[PDB]
Structures are given as structure tokens and as C-alpha cells.
């Protein structure tokens, strides 16, 4: 039987701990007014390929390295340059304490304020029913792009997430942003400390979904940003024929900090100087295994003063590697 | 006993997923006149390291991601920047119909006009003897590099490839390029729509190869470009000692669209302002398994008006992974 | 069992040759004076993610492709670009002669002058006792960065290394550098040919180590450089609890070619106007398997004329994969 022993010894020679997964997305975005997605035009057809190496350093720690490449269909000015999107180490300090260090993905609150790249440290204390997440670091994506280390506002975040049943989670968050340069309406302007606090609710009774979120900066006037959505579906990308539909409403005031929202609304701190207010309806359908088509139509877009904005619409296909 | 079976199953988990392959190359190019390969010099000794990830999305769809890096031997100005060279998804809608979407490699016709990166979509029909390939998108590499999306000419291509004889292949193609910016002799000029069309033949039998191709723009004077060549050998990089020799002739006129040809000629639309006409003799030899050595000598290079261009010569070593 | 044997054979069929390894480092560097590590600041905290593919081309040859990405915590101006750091092919013409071609790592002598990226060819000839390594190429990193081929000085190196006793090694080297540009104190200066010859010794016994290196440019005045260090420890990142400590003295003159030293001194030909002379103490400890915490404190930093320089201090975590 030692023959199979040496065969599996050879097994753990030429394979190793690294598991390679990833995805590839082909997306089309557009609007009826020029400049929403690509300057001087009203349509952006682009694609992205991501390859993620997940390696186990030891039994109690693992690290992740993701190589990401974006391109636009026909854009030949520069090569589809690869960028290390995620590079972090995940320590597991037992059954209740976990930590992340490096360039990971952070979600401030329910994701309305920020869900993207974040260089720093994160500590998770989890009862498995009530969870606490505390982060310290720097934002990288969205309205926080283009800032050097001495201009990028540091984020000190503490968030609580509890469950009120099966699949239903409520939560809150409190974050402190230092003085730094943020991008409003394409202009990088400096701002003082902000104490952004908010709450979110999510309910998944049966296959019905009902979610909402409200965040506000404590000291900055006119900063209340909230969202509220309903939906029906059972969307699983790995299972064929599982669809989903949802409709949601966004209301972001003039000074509301929306750096890079987890949602797909087209107006945030970078795009607007007078807020955003309107609906968006999204649809998902897994056409094949590990292949998913998505569509979205955002309408009734308005400014805070009653002015009118541009409707938008997107449609994309996502494919996964591993399994 | 069962634990070993569970370990074998865990191995079985990570085998049908992402498969990592690739290659490396150490190449040297030179010419008898400066500026053909590198600005203000007559030689360029560089390399390349490509790593590709063939991942099966599911039993009827796979995706390919390739990371490449080009560095000159001694050029320390910039780093060996890694680029996503290929990023596409390939679908099989049955036994014959297939499709590709994303940044994939397109070969317009036989490869004399373009065989390189393509941004768009491709549809393949046909079972085993007649194959129809319809591509729609944008060229990226070659004479179409440096253009933006709004300046890049859009290619609508349909090509037919028939199998004749035991393994001979004949074919033709018709492609339409929208108005856009293209690189003529180092300057980006805006050309109108073109309707290019051509034919090719490839008769190979008993270690003897004879190939030919001819393409032409419909509404452009002196735009035809053709190649014709012979060869003898059984080259196969995965088998040691499999040599190969070949010799071929190119003649592409001043307006002939040669964006990035599949052959190793040093002159195309980017380098020549009045055409190209000359011979090239090439040799290949697999010195080891999965290792190959290639050499090439392009001579008799002349302009369409009799002006004499410069000879060129290349020597490269390609190592194939997996 | 026979069916399981056939299954193991089938799995062995689908194994390929590419083995994915790598590492992830989170580092902090600082100095008592600004400009040593980062411009107009006295602290530089950053991170690195490297993923290495070891492909086995055939029985007597392999190739290596390394994708490396360096980022700074908070620096969002320029993305964490992925660069091909190593790309080379290794040939084995028997049990004695080996060759390398491409972009690999070269260790000129003991590593004080250079242990970093190299573009060219290398040839190793020798048995288990004596090794002779001859390399022709270009330096890419260190003080030779930022140069094109026409300015990058070609390096012709030949180094002999003989093992004395067990786990201890002595050796020497002779290297010839052509005329080219080098980054002296932030200014690219064109220098003529150099003939740098040197010796090194590395005595290891049980858990104690005594190392020394001395290199000199033959035709350049005030170009001598040397280091001498003593260490105690049994460091091995793959094993938990294996500590290590060492203390070493660097004395390198104004014209001594120190492009990219394998040590951790911050003053090498690129931020020195009058050389470097001072001590550095380093402490390593593998806190977990494949995880290692390192710290370093360089003090008594002075010029060759007696004018003092700035202290420096570093602290980093290294995570390794694959093995």
C-alpha cells in the first residue's frame, strides 16, 4: 500500500497549496446623455479578466493574490495592463477572531458608502450570530482614486451585524474619515474629519428580498444618503435557470459621501455636484452553469433641486473559472 | 484506506479547473540598415514569457486568460510590464457551431494581412470539411496600435476554409474595414472604408509543404499583396530532432493592407511607404523536447520602384511549457 | 485498490508541469531623517505580492516566470502594477555544467555589490566542492535602474566558490564593468570601465555564523568596500519558533560600486555623497510555519569624513506559499 503512499507524495509535489480561480466579465453600459460612463460618448463596452491565486500559508492562515485586467472593446491606445487588485493575508486566530492585512476588499456599512479595495488592517470578532468588524486603512477606488498617501483620507471603521432570523440580517456602522482630498464632480477638493454613521436592514424570507440602508455624516450638513429595495428570485450563478428581479430607490444628498457604492447606480460623489434621486430595476439570469447574464435600467433620475438627470442602462455577462 | 481515497478526490477537485500552461522565448533580430527593428540601432535582443490559464467554465464553455511580458536584454528604463494579452470566452453551441467573445486571436484569411489580437466576437460554423468563420470587431496589434476606440477601424470579416485532399486546405475570405486611423510609415492617416478580399491555398503532403495567398482591396489601386512558398520537414516542438526548412516570397504593394502578418517579414504597412518585394528563407529545429530553435534570413528586399531595402535576419529559442 | 490505482494514474496524467509558489510581504521602513526611504517623509510602509510559476519544460530544463507587484499603503495614484520580475530558462548539461538564460537573479560575489535582477547568460561549472560561475549581462535593478541598453553597463563576472569544512564556504570573484551610466546620489553620472575584484568568507558551525566580504575597484581611487558580521540562530521560515539574530558592520567608500546589496543597509551609491560606515542589527523569528517576522536597526551611520548620517529601522512580515 506504500506504493499509493509514494504516489500521493508525488501528488503533493507538483500541485502545491495554490488554487487558481477567477472570472471574466463582458459589460455594456449606456445612457441617453453623453458623459455618464465614457466622456463625449454615451456608451462603454468593456471587459475584465481576473485570475485569483488562493494559497494556504499554513493551517491557520491563507493569502490571496488577484491579477485583474480591464479593457475596452477596440481601445488600442494601451495594452490591457494587469494590476494586482487584491494582495492580502488572512489570519485565523481561533473560532471567533480573524484578521486581514494588506490590500483587501472592504465594505463600509451595507455597501452603499463603499465596497472596494482598501489598504490596511481588519479584525473580525464573530459569535456566528452577532459579528463585529473593525478596519483601519485607506480607500483606493471610486472618488478616492488619484490621491497620494499624504492626501488619501484614512478610514477608521467599526461595524456591527446581527441576525434577526434565517438569512435576515440587520446592522449598523460608524466610521471616521480624516482630512483629505476627495473627488466631487471631477474636482479634487480637501475636506475635514467626517463621522459617517449608518444602519442597514436585509430580509430574505422565503425567496422574497427586502433591503434598506441609511447613512449620514455627523457634522456635514446635507449628507443623508439612503436606499430601499425589493426583489424576488433565487439567483445562483453556479445553478442554471436561477433568476432574480429587483427594484430599488436611491436618494443621495449633495454632500453625502458615496465613494464607490456596492450597487450599480451611475451617480455618486464623482458624477454629481447636487445629489441623486431615482429608481433602478435589475434582472439576473444564470443562462448556463457558472455563466450569468445581468441587466439593469436606472430611471427617474433627478437632482436634489428638482432638476433632471440622464437615465442609464447596462447589460453584462459573467463567467467563473473554479468549481 | 478511505482517507487516501478522500485525498484522491480532493486532487480530482483541482484538476478539471484552471489549467496553467505557457511558453518563453529568447529572440534576436537584426538588419543591415538601422531602424528596421529598433530606433537608431541595427539589432534587438529581447525575450518574452507568456502564461496562459485555460479554465473550463462548464462542459460547453471555457475561458482563456494569458499574461505576457516583453523585455529587451538590458533595457532597464521601465519594468517588464505584464499585460493581459488574451482574455475571452469560447462557447460550443453543439457539435459544429462555436463562438468566441472578448480579446481573442483573429487570423484574417490565411494570415498575410492579420493574425493577432482582436477585440470583438467570432462565430464558427461547419463540421469537418467546410468551415465558415465570421468575425466582427477591432484590430489591436500591429499597424492598428496606438488608435483609440473612436479611431479604430471596425472589421466585419467572413472567411471560408475547405478541406481538399488528405490534408490540403484551400480557402478564401471577404472583409470590410470601416473608415479609421491606420499607421502608414509611422504616421497615423485616416483612411476610408475598404472592402478587402482574397484567397489562399495550402497543400501539404509527405513532409512537403507548398503554400500561397493573394489578397486585394476592391476600391484601392495597387493594393494586392501575395505570398508563395515551399518547405520540407516534419517540425514538431514536442519531439526532439524534428527539423524543418522553408523558403518563400512576398510581394505587397504600396497600398496593400498588411497590418500584422503571421509570417516573420520585417516589412509591413508600418515600416514601408512604397511596398515590399523579397524572399525569406527560414529554418527550424527542435533541439530538445518542448524546445525549438528558429532562424530566418530575409533577402532581396526591394521597393516596388526598384529601390533596395535592407536585409534582415532573426534567431530565436522557444521553450514550451506543459 | 486496483481501481483506485488506475484513478491515481489518471490524476497523475492531468498534472502538467507548472508549479505555482510565491510570497507576500508587509514591510515598514523608517529613518530619523527625511528622504532616506521616501521623499519628504521619514516612514515608508508598503507591501509586495509575488507569484512564481516553475514550469518543467523537459527532463533537463525548466523555466521560471515571476509576477511581482509592489504597493504602498494608501498610494492610490498609480495602481499596484504587475511586472514580470523573473523570466529565464535553466539548462542542465549533466551533473556539473548548468546554464541560465534570460532575466534571472545574479549574486555578484558574496552579494554586497549586487544580488538582484540580471539580464543575460550565466554558466555554472563545478562539483559539490568547487563551483565557478560566469555571467555576462546587464544589471536591471538598484543604482543601474532607469538606464536604456545603450547606457546600461555590461557586466562580465566570474566567481569561484569553494566549500571548506562543512556548511562553510570561502570564495572570490572578478567582474568587469563597461562604460555606462550609474545613479550617483540621485544624479546619473557616466563612468568609464571598472575592474572590481573581491573575496568573501562564510563560516557556519552549529548555530553560529561569521561572515565577511571585501570588494575593490581596481583602477578607481577610494572605491574599496567591506562588511563583517556575526550571527547566532537557526532560522528557517518553514519551521515555527526558529529565531535568529545577527550584527554586522558595513564600511563602503565613496566610489565603491554598491548597486543593490543583498543586505539591508539604506546607503548604497544612490543616496550617498561620501559613502557609508556603520552597524546594523537584524532579528528574525518565524512566528508560524512559512510566516516570518523580521526587524532591523541600523545605527552609527556616518560618512567617510566623519559627518554623521541618519539611523534607520525596519520591520516586516513574510509569508511563503507552495512548500
Residue numbers in the entry:
A (entry chain C), C (entry chain A): 100 to 422
B (entry chain B): 100 to 421
Task: Give excerpts from the publication.
The E. coli cell wall does not contain polyaminated PG, the native ligand of VpOmpM1. Therefore, to exclude the possibility that in our structure of VpOmpM1 purified from E. coli the stalk region is misfolded due to the absence of polyaminated PG, we purified a His-tagged OmpM1 construct expressed in V. parvula (native VpOmpM1) and determined its structure by single particle cryo-EM to 3.3 Å resolution. The β-barrel structures are virtually identical (Cα-Cα root-mean-square deviation 0.239 Å), but there are differences in the relative orientation of the stalk. In reconstructions without enforced symmetry, the α-helices forming the coiled-coil are not equivalent in either dataset, as they exit the OM plane in different orientations. A similar interaction was observed in the native VpOmpM1 structure: at two inter-protomer interfaces, R113 interacts with the carbonyl oxygen of G115 and the sidechain of N116 (both part of the β-barrel end of the stalk). Interestingly, the R113-N155 interaction was not observed in the native VpOmpM1 structure, and the R113-G115/N116 interaction was not observed in the VpOmpM1 structure from E. coli. It is possible that the two protein constructs differ slightly in their lowest energy states which are observed in the averaged cryo-EM data. We simulated the native VpOmpM1 model to which an AlphaFold243 prediction of the unmodeled region of the stalk was grafted and fit into the low-resolution cryo-EM density. The simulations revealed substantial movement of the stalk in the periplasmic space. The coiled-coil does not kink throughout the 1 μs simulation, and the movement of the stalk is due to flexibility at the interface between the stalk and the β-barrels.
Most diderm phyla from the Terrabacteria group have recently been shown to lack well-characterised OM attachment systems, but instead have OmpM, which could represent an ancestral tethering system in bacteria. OmpM consists of an N-terminal periplasmic S-layer homology (SLH) domain connected via a linker region to a C-terminal OM β-barrel. Here we use single particle cryo-EM, X-ray crystallography, molecular dynamics simulations, bioinformatic analyses and functional assays to show that OmpM1 from V. parvula (VpOmpM1) is a general porin with similar structural and functional properties to E. coli OmpF, with an additional mobile periplasmic region that can bind V. parvula PG and take on different folds.
